[PDB]
Amino acid sequence: HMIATGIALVGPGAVGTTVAALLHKAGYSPLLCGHTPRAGIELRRDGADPIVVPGPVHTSPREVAGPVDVLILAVKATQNDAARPWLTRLCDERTVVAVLQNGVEQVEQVQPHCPSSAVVPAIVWCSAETQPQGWVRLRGEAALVVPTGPAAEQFAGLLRGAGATVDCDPDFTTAAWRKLLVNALAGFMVLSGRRSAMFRRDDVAALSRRYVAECLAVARAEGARLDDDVVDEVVRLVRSAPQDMGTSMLADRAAHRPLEWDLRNGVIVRKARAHGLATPISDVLVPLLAAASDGPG
Amino acid sequence: HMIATGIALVGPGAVGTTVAALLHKAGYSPLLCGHTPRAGIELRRDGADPIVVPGPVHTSPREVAGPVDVLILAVKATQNDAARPWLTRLCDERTVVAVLQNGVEQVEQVQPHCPSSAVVPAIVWCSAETQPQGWVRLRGEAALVVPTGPAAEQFAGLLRGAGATVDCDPDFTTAAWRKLLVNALAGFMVLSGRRSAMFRRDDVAALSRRYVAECLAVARAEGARLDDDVVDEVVRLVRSAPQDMGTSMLADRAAHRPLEWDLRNGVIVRKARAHGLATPISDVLVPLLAAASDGPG
Ligand SMILES: NC(=O)c1ccc[n+]([C@@H]2O[C@H](COP(=O)([O-])OP(=O)(O)OC[C@H]3O[C@@H](n4cnc5c(N)ncnc54)[C@H](OP(=O)(O)O)[C@@H]3O)[C@@H](O)[C@H]2O)c1
Numbered sequence: 001h002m003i004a005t006g007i008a009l010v011g012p013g014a015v016g017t018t019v020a021a022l023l024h025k026a027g028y029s030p031l032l033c034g035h036t037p038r039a040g041i042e043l044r045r046d047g048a049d050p051i052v053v054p055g056p057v058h059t060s061p062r063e064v065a066g067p068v069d070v071l072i073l074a075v076k077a078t079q080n081d082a083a084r085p086w087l088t089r090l091c092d093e094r095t096v097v098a099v100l101q102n103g104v105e106q107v108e109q110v111q112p113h114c115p116s117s118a119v120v121p122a123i124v125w126c127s128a129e130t131q132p133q134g135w136v137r138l139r140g141e142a143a144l145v146v147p148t149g150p151a152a153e154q155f156a157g158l159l160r161g162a163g164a165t166v167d168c169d170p171d172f173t174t175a176a177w178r179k180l181l182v183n184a185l186a187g188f189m190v191l192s193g194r195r196s197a198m199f200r201r202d203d204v205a206a207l208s209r210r211y212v213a214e215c216l217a218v219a220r221a222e223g224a225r226l227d228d229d230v231v232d233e234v235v236r237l238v239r240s241a242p243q244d245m246g247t248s249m250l251a252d253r254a255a256h257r258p259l260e261w262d263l264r265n266g267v268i269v270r271k272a273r274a275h276g277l278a279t280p281i282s283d284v285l286v287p288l289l290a291a292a293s294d295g296p297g
Numbered sequence: 298h299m300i301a302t303g304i305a306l307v308g309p310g311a312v313g314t315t316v317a318a319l320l321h322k323a324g325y326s327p328l329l330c331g332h333t334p335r336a337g338i339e340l341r342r343d344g345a346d347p348i349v350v351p352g353p354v355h356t357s358p359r360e361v362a363g364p365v366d367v368l369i370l371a372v373k374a375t376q377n378d379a380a381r382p383w384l385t386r387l388c389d390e391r392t393v394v395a396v397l398q399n400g401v402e403q404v405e406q407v408q409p410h411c412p413s414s415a416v417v418p419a420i421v422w423c424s425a426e427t428q429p430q431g432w433v434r435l436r437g438e439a440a441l442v443v444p445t446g447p448a449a450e451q452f453a454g455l456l457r458g459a460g461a462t463v464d465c466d467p468d469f470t471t472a473a474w475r476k477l478l479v480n481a482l483a484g485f486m487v488l489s490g491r492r493s494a495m496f497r498r499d500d501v502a503a504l505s506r507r508y509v510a511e512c513l514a515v516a517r518a519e520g521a522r523l524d525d526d527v528v529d530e531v532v533r534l535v536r537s538a539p540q541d542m543g544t545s546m547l548a549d550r551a552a553h554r555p556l557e558w559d560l561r562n563g564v565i566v567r568k569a570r571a572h573g574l575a576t577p578i579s580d581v582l583v584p585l586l587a588a589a590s591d592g593p594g
Pocket residue numbers: 010011012013014015016033034035036074075076077079082083086100101102124125126127128129130248260
């Protein structure tokens with residue numbers, strides 16, 4: 001195991017396929033660990049040739065053998081509990097576990113499933129969406145942000161070696177909250193059932209700036225070092241996206257799947273409470289998102 | 298025209314079919330005036346035999362001849378402008394025009410389309426929903442509230458004579474706002490994409506009471522005579538509905554049709570402004586509803 005790097009991908013979805021495709025094109029053979037059987041997985045980046053990554057997608061932990069050197073976790077955070085048996089099977093104390101999930105709670109959520117492994121949280125900036133036809137559409141290059149330190153630097157080496165854009169940030173808390181401001185705001189799309197062009201409306205954009213400011217106060221109390229300019233920057237960013245760009249949580253709502261509402265929006269309320277911060281806009285959005293996700297009704 | 302009463306139904310949808318069916322069963326032959334051609338329309342009240350009302354549904358004003366004695370308008374308020382040529386064709390100064398729409402702006406919206414006719418606003422309490430199979434499902438009896446005065450009493454006579462439950466209320470402003478508190482709250486269902494059982498959640502119910510109180514302040518400034526008890530009563534009412542009961546605005550959202558968002562929710566903001574009343578919860582809900590309805594995205 002000194003030369004060949006054993007890599008497992010747990011969660012071969014939009015983000016997982018994006019990463020598996022880069023690894024495959026670089027010549028690695030990641031072990032695909034999923035929920036829905038398939039012979040392989042396919043990534044189509046706009047403007048590029050398709051990349052097909054051979055499987056099979058394994059759907060029982062009994063079918064695979066560990067330990068592996070690197071485990072890339074790309075399930076939704078709603079699926080972390082169900083993914084646990086993959087981590088038990090595949091991780092030991094030398095495994096590096098990369099958690100490619102939104103929010104700011106990656107290590108806290110996943111570390112207990114691999115208690116002796118180094119966990120590398122990874123902020124992913126990309127637009128990836130599974131199509132009805134079975135392949136994943138990637139619009140633009142993906143970029144990842146990880147911390148500094150040995151495990152994170154090893155993981156960044158692996159991805160950079162395969163052609164990925166990765167930043168090792170000595171202030172990961174700030175990087176994670178920066179992405180969370182964007183993802184939290186994108187929750188509006190789930191309630192309206194509209195793509196990014198909804199933010200081009202004056203009324204929505206005004207509301208959006210107030211919400212991002214409310215989220216920003218919480219981010220700062222939690223240690224994020226962000227300028228006041230970020231409020232309007234977030235709103236300009238979503239307005240500048242292609243008019244039909246959605247978000248993964250809207251795709252889940254349209255497929256009637258559980259949402260990462262607590263990871264992306266509930267977290268604002270939960271973290272606000274120790275600091276005694278008010279979140280009046282979140283107090284409206286969060287119950288509607290949680291109901292949308294979990295019912296009843 | 299002293300004995301036979303000429304009746305036209307403009308808008309043969311969920312509510313329109315509900316009313317047409319009662320009239321038909323009483324022996325009237327209402328002229329059906331619609332948008333989508335059909336040979337007739339069908340009402341199925343739960344627990345009762347189906348009632349089929351013969352058409353055809355006329356879809357051009359050129360195909361019909363007025364004036365009529367009673368015109369029953371049951372289009373959505375989003376369709377009032379498109380329905381105008383029916384009113385021009387069918388109404389004269391002796392026509393009674395009944396407006397079976399939600400909100401509190403019936404006379405203001407419709408009177409200019411029939412400037413010399415008496416307009417009777419009608420608050421409808423019912424649960425009617427067009428099914429994929431083409432017939433309308435009615436769950437429970439329908440009840441209507443109209444004002445007092447000659448035109449309203451003539452209209453109530455006609456419906457009561459046909460077996461309908463109708464109240465002639467000397468304080469119609471209060472009756473209209475009472476229904477609007479319910480309908481405004483039901484907007485939550487459109488954002489969450491869930492039926493009435495969503496209100497059984499603690500978080501939603503807490504938010505709901507705050508929203509109904511915000512709406513109540515506006516209703517009172519506009520002349521509604523409602524007790525403080527109404528806030529919790531509205532929330533108990535939606536919780537007590539069958540778990541799968543929706544609202545017409547959710548059905549429109551699911552069919553990708555324009556919503557009555559301004560009639561049911563935008564009105565709270567618009568009326569609050571002359572009284573200098575704050576509407577912070579509406580300031581969140583309304584832009585999301587308007588975007589859901591009208592895009593872009
Ligand atoms: N999509 C984006 O553009 C994007 C961008 C940045 C960050 N993110 C974040 O990245 C994370 C992953 O998002 P995604 O969009 O890739 O989600 P996704 O497309 O829904 O992918 C999740 C994958 O995990 C599989 N899965 C479910 N349960 C599993 C289990 N017990 N074991 C193994 N695999 C399982 C799913 O299969 P089934 O669907 O068959 O259950 C699916 O293939 C989320 O935290 C998201 O917020 C997404």
